[PDB]
């Protein structure tokens, strides 16, 4: 299932509880791993995907703001989960920091992650 | 309170969000376009302690496009930033991933940018 | 005819262009913004049979930021359509890739929307 | 060098010339690799890239007529060519269809693309 521990290809750790109705919430970090790498997310996903060998969809955020840095920036994950031997989370990303409006043209960077079980 | 309310965009889409203080995002969506009826819930993350320069709140949401009525297998991010003022606005761009099959896995993301703004 | 000369973008940016018979897209850009001056080359395909109902004319270019003055390493890729009538536009999303080491490859790509109104 | 022939992770095939002063020009076939595949593409590329390690930016598109079929439909590659033993072309890109007014909200997938000159 989506619930777990996920790794994406730069190393980052995606913890997640997936909700019977829909909800993901959990912890994202850095590859770093100690308590200034890791920041809240929440998110959403279908809970009842179709049958017919289909991936799930899902998506979630991370606002950059913990207890100890604030990058006033949020990434979204948009993708799929697709279960079986070896599950992965393929996603594409979009990252907007904070800009004034002059700025605002190179705000968002793009990006794709996949996530998979397995620890590096 | 300045992101927490009513929002409006560009397609007729209707936007009701409530900010925590905590960074939280929740709500609702109901999409003016494509697949989907009534409402969806939303949930998401807000910078919750901005710069205070003249700079934007960074944000993001997620819909999953299922609810008690419709479902469409399938999900969007909505990623961008908050303007405040007398006029806010919240300006985005957005990721439509809907569930494939490996083989229609390379179509499986629309990508747009929707303006929203408070009412 | 259509596609063929001068359109401006929503930051001021000038885009002159020349559609060819076989699809081709030829002309300059001079960007309004970041690390770039006076005129760079572009190229590009377009659609040369589009639909003939009610659909705007698919197309795309690039511009590398490379000319005899400056050098961003980088490049922008302009991929939208073409809507003609009396106010023809151009409505685009864009990707801006620059050169980086391995290490910084995961922000390597900037993403936006673009409108071009012919003038 | 970026001249010659790439192929992608869906086995598409990619011939490109790279000229002296940042052009890009060739053809991009589909899988099946016979006439009715096969597309023209131009785009432009950084003919002076940074001597740091760093990649080469570039750019191509490909509109999706040619004598056999129409999609009425482009699709653009930005990405950045890394040279050495197993180069690679990294990209993301923007596949825009022709659409009345009312359907330019779904006119545009996104996705990526890693090429290399491996034949499959
Ligand atoms: C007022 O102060 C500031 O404005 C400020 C202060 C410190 C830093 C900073 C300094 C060093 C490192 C990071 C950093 C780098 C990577 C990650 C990370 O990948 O976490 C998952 C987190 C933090 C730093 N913060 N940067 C961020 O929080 C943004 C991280 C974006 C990671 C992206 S999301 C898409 C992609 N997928 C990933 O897993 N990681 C990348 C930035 C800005
Ligand atoms: C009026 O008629 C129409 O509107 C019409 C007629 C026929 C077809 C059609 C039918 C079957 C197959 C294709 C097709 C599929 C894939 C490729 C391909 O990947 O070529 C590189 C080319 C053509 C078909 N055409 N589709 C296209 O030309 C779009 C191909 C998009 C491929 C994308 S670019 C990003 C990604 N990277 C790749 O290498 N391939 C994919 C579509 C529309």
């Known amino acids: 299932g989506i619930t777990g521990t996920w790794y994406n290809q730069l ?9 019977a109705d829909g909800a993901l919430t959990g912890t994202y970090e ?3 791993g100690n308590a200034e790498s890791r920041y809240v997310l929440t998110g959403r996903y279908d809970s009842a995907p179709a049958t017919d060998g289909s991936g ?13 840095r604030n990058a ?24 907007t920091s904070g800009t004034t409006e002059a700025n605002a043209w190179k705000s968002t960077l793009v990006g794709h992650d996949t996530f998979t079980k397995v620890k590096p």
Chains 1, 4 share one sequence.
């Open 30 to 32: 850095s590859a770093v």
């Open 11 to 19: 190393g980052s750790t995606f913890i997640v509880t997936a909700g």
């Open 72 to 95: 006033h920036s949020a990434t979204t994950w948009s993708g799929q989960y697709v279960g079986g031997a070896e599950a992965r989370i393929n996603t594409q990303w979009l990252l």
């Open 56 to 68: 799930t969809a899902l998506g979630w955020t991370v606002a950059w703001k913990n207890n100890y």
